[PDB]
Write a protein that binds this ligand. Structure first.
Ligand code: NA
Length: 129
């Protein structure tokens, strides 16, 4: 599913991501824009041979099982395919674990490089939340 900007902001809010670990809803929408372009089906291979899955490009190295990432963990206890569903519940649940791991949203390099310190509230502008 390709989410609308406000459509995804509403879904992330409903799933409790707004100000989770202190990150405003705009930070999450901005991360999802630059990780996936709001596409739940987005997959990208990393150089280390792990893969990033779904709207928040969650990495098979640590968080989900894809059965092709040697020496990797599955800390969200989910198949990586569950991160590609039109229902973002699994992605959000797993993202809560990632952002709680100690480095906050710096875990998302695209967040650090493209959202951090920017006017992230712009990403929820015009949205009826
Ligand atoms: Na894994």
């Amino acid at each position: 599913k390709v989410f609308g900007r406000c459509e995804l902001a509403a879904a992330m809010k409903r799933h409790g991501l707004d100000n989770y670990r202190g990150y405003s809803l705009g930070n999450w929408v901005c991360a999802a824009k630059f990780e996936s372009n709001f596409n739940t089906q987005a997959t990208n291979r990393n150089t280390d041979g792990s893969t990033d899955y779904g709207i928040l490009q969650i990495n098979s190295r640590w968080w989900c099982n894809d059965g092709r990432t040697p020496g990797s963990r599955n800390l969200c206890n989910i198949p990586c395919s569950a991160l590609l569903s039109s229902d973002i519940t699994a992605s959000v649940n797993c993202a809560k674990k990632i952002v709680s791991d100690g480095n906050g949203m710096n875990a998302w390099v695209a967040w650090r490089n493209r959202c951090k310190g920017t006017d992230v509230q712009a990403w929820i502008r015009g949205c009826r939340l």
